[PDB]
Amino acid sequence: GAAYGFAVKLPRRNAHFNPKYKEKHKPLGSMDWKKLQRGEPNSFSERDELEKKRGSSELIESKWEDGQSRVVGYTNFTYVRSGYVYLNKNNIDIKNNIVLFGPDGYLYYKGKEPSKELPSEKITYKGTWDYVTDAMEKQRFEGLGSAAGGDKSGALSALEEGVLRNQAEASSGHTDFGMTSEFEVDFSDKTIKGTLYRNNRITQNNSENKQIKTTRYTIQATLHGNRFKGKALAADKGATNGSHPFISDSDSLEGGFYGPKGEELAGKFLSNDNKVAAVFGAKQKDAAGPATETVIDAYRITGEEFKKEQIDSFGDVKKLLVDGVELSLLPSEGNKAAFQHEIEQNGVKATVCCSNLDYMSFGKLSKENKDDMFLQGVRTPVSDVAARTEANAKYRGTWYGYIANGTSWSGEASNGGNRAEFDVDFSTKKISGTLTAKDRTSPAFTITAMIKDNGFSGVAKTGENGFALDPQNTGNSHYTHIEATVSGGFYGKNAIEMGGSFSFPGNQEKASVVFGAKRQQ
Ligand SMILES: [Cs+]
Ligand SMILES: [Cs+]
Ligand SMILES: [Cs+]
Ligand SMILES: [Cs+]
């Protein structure tokens, strides 16, 4: 349920003189978060609206920076942008009826190329985080500063007074700046620990308070896909001084990894008391060698061309992306579930299988009237597959296929129809299998493969005599025989399912096949 990125509009209560036009409180909520679609991290709908609204000059965007809020060494982010984007344009409607003071903008986080590949060991990510509060009348946090508002405005992190930003302080390699974030991730444990800090500018003679770093939060999360869900723990849960709105925790912490190898990550959370909404983004340090592995497979087989086109995935099998917009693969008002179930949702139309599979979905899709064949699924990584030492698995499932020369023929998944048996022998890693067509005696495709990592690779060939496109009508039965390279992966919790595909172009006969099966014996 977690998407590309999110943005919450920076709260500005209607601080008007009061013929009942004055807004008492401009609170925050989960419904005040708005979702961001595909594109570049440093640009989206509302931000473009800001750019249009901009005009003469002056756009404030939290990049880095290099003036406030950065960690040196964990410098440039290519896949992720998280922070604040606002404008100093106040809203005035003496033409009735509006009065808005403070930053007109959004607190967002956005990433591109969701990770289908993650490290297999402990990796630390450093970065930054930013917050914003609601707009309550006569609400001020002395610890944050009056310049931060919180009356009329909503206490923006970019305006927190007693923080270090300018880098002139300690001209050496002083690393952390402003509100920094630190994370340690154990991918083998599927666990994420974190801490949201606050770098203090130790006053010239250190006047009234305060030491180097104020621990604002900690973070506890777990993985399931390429995203992470969990809780944010406020360090000052015992607070009543009213010095800062970091009193309550947050059971609404969501996030995700970005980059092909998962070299970046970003997320958000909203405090339980609906007082503080916060975002964060972190990457690794500056011929790198982090041991990695694939966790998510998600591709379309173009129709026809040749190869496969990789498509974005969040680990949610129940829906897919077409590079543009979301496509739900669940039956609604049509009644679940049978085996296969096709759906159309405005932009395109598709058919998805099946019911016996929970960790993977595969089928066909259409828009250009040249159908492609998608396959997606969350793999079963990785030491679980490696440690497995059985003797014979015997997977069983089915497949979507298309063979043409011409003449052209296609086959769909069945519940005597299209079937697919697979024999997996661990310890030796050797796997064999066959997939058969509709009402036909002999196997259509024989697949021989072997297991590496959390996947399997091999070859699929037709019968010795070939595969007749027209078994009946003997003259030009079109015995098209095809030998191609088939690649697949193990999807599930205990590798209870498997999937894969193979395609083939030529300088005259073409083909494309996707398949999925379930472990039983
Ligand atoms: Cs404080
Ligand atoms: Cs204010
Ligand atoms: Cs200051
Ligand atoms: Cs709480």
Numbering used by the authors: 43 to 328, 335 to 463, 466 to 557, 563 to 576
Recite the paper's sentences.
Neisseria meningitidis is highly adapted to its human host and acquires necessary iron in the host environment using specialized receptor systems that sequester iron from circulating host glycoproteins; notably transferrin (Tf). TbpA functions as a TonB-dependent conduit allowing iron transport through the outer membrane. TbpB extends from the outer membrane surface by virtue of an N-terminal peptide region that is anchored to the outer membrane by fatty acyl chains on the N-terminal cysteine and is involved in the initial capture of iron-loaded Tf. The current study was initiated to explore the sequence and structural diversity of the TbpB and TbpA proteins to gain insights into the covariation and coevolutionary correlations between the TbpA proteins partnered with each TbpB isotype.
The overall approach was to develop structural models for TbpB and TbpA from strain B16B6 to compare to known structures of Tbps from strains with isotype II TbpBs and use this insight to provide a structural context for exploring the sequence diversity of the receptor from of a large collection of N. meningitidis isolates. The overall structural organization was similar, consisting of two orthogonally oriented lobes comprised of N-terminal handle and C-terminal barrel domains. In contrast to the isotype II TbpBs, the loop regions of the handle and barrel domains of the N-terminal lobe were fully resolved in the B16B6 TbpB structure. Although much of the core secondary structural elements of both isotypes are nearly superimposable, there are subtle differences in loop regions and a tilt of a helix in the N-lobe handle domain. The primary differences between the TbpB isotypes are present in the unresolved regions of the crystal structure where there is poor electron density in the maps found in the linker region between lobes, and loop regions of the C-lobe (dotted regions – extended description in Supplementary Section). The residues comprising the anchoring peptide that attaches to the outer membrane are not resolved in any of the structures. As revealed by the structural study with the B16B6 TbpB, the most distinct differences between the isotype I and isotype II TbpBs is in the linker region and the C-lobe region where the large loops are reduced or absent in the isotype I TbpB. Isotype I variants also possess longer anchor peptides and shorter linker regions than their isotype II counterparts. The anchor peptide is observed in a locked conformation bound to the C-terminal amino acids of the C-lobe via an antiparallel B strand exchange, while the remaining anchor peptide wraps around the C-lobe domain.
